[PDB]
Amino acid sequence: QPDASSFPSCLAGLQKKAQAQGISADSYERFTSGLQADLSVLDLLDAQPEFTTPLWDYLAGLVDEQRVSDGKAMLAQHDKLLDQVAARYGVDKYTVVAVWGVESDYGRIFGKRPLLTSLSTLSCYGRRQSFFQGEFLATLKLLQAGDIRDAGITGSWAGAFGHTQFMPSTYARIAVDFDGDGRRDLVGSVPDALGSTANYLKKAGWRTGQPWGYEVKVPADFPASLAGRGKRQPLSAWVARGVRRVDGQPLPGGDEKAAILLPAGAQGPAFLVYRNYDAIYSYNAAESYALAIALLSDRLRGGSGLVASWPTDDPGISRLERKQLQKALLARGYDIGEADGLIGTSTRKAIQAEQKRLGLTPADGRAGRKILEALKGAQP
Numbered sequence: 001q002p003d004a005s006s007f008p009s010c011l012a013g014l015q016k017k018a019q020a021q022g023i024s025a026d027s028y029e030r031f032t033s034g035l036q037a038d039l040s041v042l043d044l045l046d047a048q049p050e051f052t053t054p055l056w057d058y059l060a061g062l063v064d065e066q067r068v069s070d071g072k073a074m075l076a077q078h079d080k081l082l083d084q085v086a087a088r089y090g091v092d093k094y095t096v097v098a099v100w101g102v103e104s105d106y107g108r109i110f111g112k113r114p115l116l117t118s119l120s121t122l123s124c125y126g127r128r129q130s131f132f133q134g135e136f137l138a139t140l141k142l143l144q145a146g147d148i149r150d151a152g153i154t155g156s157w158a159g160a161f162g163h164t165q166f167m168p169s170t171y172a173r174i175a176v177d178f179d180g181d182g183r184r185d186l187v188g189s190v191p192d193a194l195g196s197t198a199n200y201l202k203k204a205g206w207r208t209g210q211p212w213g214y215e216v217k218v219p220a221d222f223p224a225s226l227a228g229r230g231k232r233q234p235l236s237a238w239v240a241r242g243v244r245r246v247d248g249q250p251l252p253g254g255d256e257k258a259a260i261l262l263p264a265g266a267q268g269p270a271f272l273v274y275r276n277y278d279a280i281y282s283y284n285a286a287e288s289y290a291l292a293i294a295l296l297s298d299r300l301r302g303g304s305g306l307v308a309s310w311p312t313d314d315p316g317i318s319r320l321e322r323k324q325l326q327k328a329l330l331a332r333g334y335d336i337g338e339a340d341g342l343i344g345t346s347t348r349k350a351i352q353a354e355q356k357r358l359g360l361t362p363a364d365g366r367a368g369r370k371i372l373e374a375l376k377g378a379q380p
């Protein structure tokens with residue numbers, strides 16, 4: 001089993017590796033002095049989840065009306081900067097602000113855990129030590145360079161942090177100094193953050209002026225077997241198969257490769273995705289985040305949102321509504337923690353108990369509209 005007694009020898013070993021890669025002993029002592037193993041970070045790894053979260057729950061929180069209103073506020077406030085970012089990297093401002101909204105809520109996301117604690121612990125314990133050692137050493141190089149200046153910086157357990165939720169190795173490779181002050185500051189500089197977001201997408205293959213894709217309508221008998229991010233066909237093949245834009249307009253046709261996504265079955269919402277969707281997808285390597293960015297970018301361009309409905313009687317609910325649901329559960333005597341809007345195991349267990357009590361099916365523990373409307377009390 002992991003034991004805290006091994007941590008000092010592990011940290012001392014990493015000092016020699018750090019020195020070999022140009023991190024000074026002074027830097028290493030300054031940034032790692034009083035680091036302690038936090039073995040609780042391993043509780044979040046190779047943890048089998050008890051609950052399944054469908055795509056429409058991710059989208060209800062990532063693309064909620066507050067995310068859309070906040071994004072339109074940022075497009076207004078940062079208009080001139082965003083034009084300069086688009087001019088310098090060839091990525092449109094709606095895409096850049098959509099990524100900023102989904103990844104960090106425009107730089108407002110609470111980092112639960114100190115970066116250097118998570119990464120040093122994961123460098124010394126568990127089954128991914130070599131990977132996390134690279135991330136740990138990349139963080140120390142960024143601190144030595146003064147790109148990062150807060151050794152107590154917080155982020156995800158896996159080391160994603162700042163406006164962009166880059167991991168340290170991504171930060172090293174992709175971060176830009178947009179404002180030209182000699183610092184690549186993705187924590188405190190909105191210019192550096194938006195420029196780095198754009199640079200990430202450019203490096204991932206973004207084609208200037210091309211769409212991510214769009215929502216489409218497929219015919220009743222469209223074969224679900226043809227769908228998937230990996231299964232591209234020329235647009236002419238999709239036209240031949242009766243695929244159309246959701247407003248009935250034809251596709252462009254010709255020879256450009258595109259995939260159809262049917263994340264919720266042959267008559268659920270359908271998406272035609274181009275190479276720029278693949279660039280977006282690379283940021284989180286998860287359809288939930290990739291379609292959140294694409295659909296938020298559609299809302300920020302003044303789109304009304306998804307035309308098709310998800311196959312549920314229980315639509316997802318906003319971040320504000322998740323807080324209302326958590327307050328409702330606390331009011332009914334479920335000790336689920338703070339009403340922070342994060343739907344974790346404690347909340348989902350209380351939802352499932354209420355679903356079974358109320359005869360709601362499925363008793364899936366989802367934070368959906370059905371349980372919200374059932375449990376809301378006074379002044380939600």
Ligand SMILES: [Ca+2]
Nearest residue numbers: 177181183192
């Ligand atoms: Ca800068």
